Design a protein around this ligand. Structure first.
Ligand SMILES: [Cl-]
Ligand SMILES: [Cl-]
Ligand SMILES: [Xe]
Ligand SMILES: [Xe]
Ligand SMILES: [Xe]
Length: 162
């Protein structure tokens, strides 16, 4: 298992514009197009991201390309964030994938706000971190996904995804 397969399981794959769990227009493997309630706005953003007139529909290869760009951007964002980088660098490979999934889902600002859990992770207090991460709007809104990510930080194995 790796970060790509992990995220492909959590995000699914959809070739037509769809609304995500928060009701925002998205396409592909969780690629958020806009927070705007406007379908046309989402369609304009899609065409711009793909480089053609897609008419709200893309191919699998195009979805995979947006996904590659999005994973890369997510990791790079962590390395560029002063509150995140030190935590991420202290983690093992498995746990780093869990950090990346959270960032892909909620953005780096969002993750950088889990101050207390960040500290627990950095000190390798796994069970404690797991309990603190669950006290969040993130966990109450997407509990199955949050549980899988949380168990990954807690155990450092891919069991939740097998
Ligand atoms: Cl883009
Ligand atoms: Cl869920
Ligand atoms: Xe992190
Ligand atoms: Xe994190
Ligand atoms: Xe976190």
């Amino acid at each position: 298992m790796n970060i790509f397969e992990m995220l492909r399981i959590d995000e699914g794959l959809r070739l037509k514009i769809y609304k995500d769990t928060e009701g925002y227009y998205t396409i592909g493997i969780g690629h958020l197009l806009t927070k705007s309630p406007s379908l046309n706005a989402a369609k304009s953003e899609l065409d711009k991201a793909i480089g053609r007139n897609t008419n709200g529909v893309i191919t699998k290869d195009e979805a995979e390309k947006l996904f590659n760009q999005d994973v890369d951007a997510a990791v790079r964002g962590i390395l560029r964030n002063a509150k995140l980088k030190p935590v991420y660098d202290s983690l093992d490979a498995v746990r780093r994938a869990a950090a990346i999934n959270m960032v892909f889902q909620m953005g780096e600002t969002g993750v950088a706000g889990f101050t207390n859990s960040l500290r627990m992770l950095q000190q390798k207090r796994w069970d404690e971190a797991a309990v603190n991460l669950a006290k969040s709007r993130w966990y109450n809104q997407t509990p199955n996904r949050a549980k899988r990510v949380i168990t990954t930080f807690r155990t450092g194995t891919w069991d939740a995804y097998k």
